[PDB]
C-alpha cells in the first residue's frame, strides 16, 4: 500500500541500471502481485522502498518486511519450503567475480574451473528431485527433476536473489571472456528456459548493454 521502489538508474542516467540487488526487490514485489511504482535514482543507495510513507532501506529487511507485510490470502508467501534452495549456488556470483575481475592470464584457469565447480553444484541441484517431488510409486532408477525452479514450481524469493545474478553472468562472462555456461549443464538451462519464460524476470532484466557497462573494465587483456 503506497509502495515505491527506487532502484539503481542507467548509463544513460534514466534507464533502469544494472544491479542484482535492484532486480531482486523488483522480482519480489511483482510477484507479491503488489501495486508498486518504480523510480530510478541518478545521485543513499539504491534499492530502498517507501511503504505508506515510511522509508525502508537494506534489501535482506526488505524482503523480510515484505514478506512479513504482505500475505496470504492477500499475497502468497514467496518464503522456501526446502532450506537447501536458498543455498544452492549461493557462491556462484563469488566466483564470477573472482573469474571477471582477475587480470592476471596466468590465474585465469583457477578462476574458471572454480566458477565452473560452482555451476556443477547448483546444476546437480536443478536436476536433483526435492522432497516429495517424486511419486513415492515411481521406479528406483536415477530421476531427473522437471521442475520449474530452485524450490518447485513456483518461484520463490531464492530464485528472486539468484537469477539477477545468473543474468549478469551469463551476459557479461559470454561479453568479456567468450565464456557460456555449458550446454551439458542441462539443470541451469532448463531453469533459465523456465525463468526467461516469466514476465517478473525477464521484463525487469536491465539492458544488455546497461549489464555490458557495468562491467566494461573487464575489457582489458589479462596481463
Not at 8 to 31: H, T, V
Not at 52 to 66: A, Q, R, S
Not at 115 to 133: H, I, W
Amino acid at each position: 500500500m503506497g509502495i515505491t521502489l527506487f532502484v539503481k538508474a542507467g548509463y544513460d542516467g534514466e534507464s533502469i541500471g544494472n544491479c542484482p540487488f535492484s532486480q531482486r526487490l523488483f522480482m519480489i514485489l511483482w510477484l507479491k502481485g503488489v501495486i508498486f511504482n518504480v523510480t530510478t535514482v541518478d545521485l543513499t543507495n539504491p534499492p530502498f522502498m517507501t511503504f505508506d510513507g515510511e522509508v525502508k532501506t537494506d534489501v535482506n529487511k526488505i524482503e523480510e518486511f515484505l514478506e512479513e507485510k504482505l500475505v496470504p490470502p492477500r499475497y502468497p508467501k514467496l518464503g522456501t519450503q526446502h532450506p537447501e534452495s536458498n543455498s544452492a549456488g549461493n557462491d556462484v556470483f563469488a566466483k564470477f567475480s573472482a573469474f571477471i575481475k582477475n587480470t592476471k592470464k596466468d590465474a585465469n584457469e583457477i578462476y574458471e574451473k572454480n566458477l565452473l565447480r560452482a555451476l556443477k553444484k547448483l546444476d546437480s541441484y536443478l536436476n536433483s528431485p526435492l522432497p516429495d517431488e517424486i511419486d513415492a510409486d515411481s521406479s528406483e532408477d536415477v530421476t531427473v527433476s522437471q521442475r520449474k525452479f530452485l524450490d518447485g514450481d513456483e518461484l520463490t524469493l531464492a530464485d528472486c536473489n539468484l537469477l539477477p545474478k545468473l543474468h549478469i553472468i551469463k551476459i557479461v562472462a559470454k561479453k568479456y571472456r567468450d565464456f557460456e555456461f555449458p550446454s551439458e549443464m542441462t539443470g541451469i538451462w532448463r531453469y533459465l528456459n523456465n525463468a526467461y519464460a516469466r514476465d517478473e524476470f525477464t521484463n525487469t532484466c536491465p539492458a544488455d548493454r546497461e549489464i555490458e557497462h557495468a562491467y566494461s573494465d573487464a575489457a582489458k587483456r589479462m596481463k
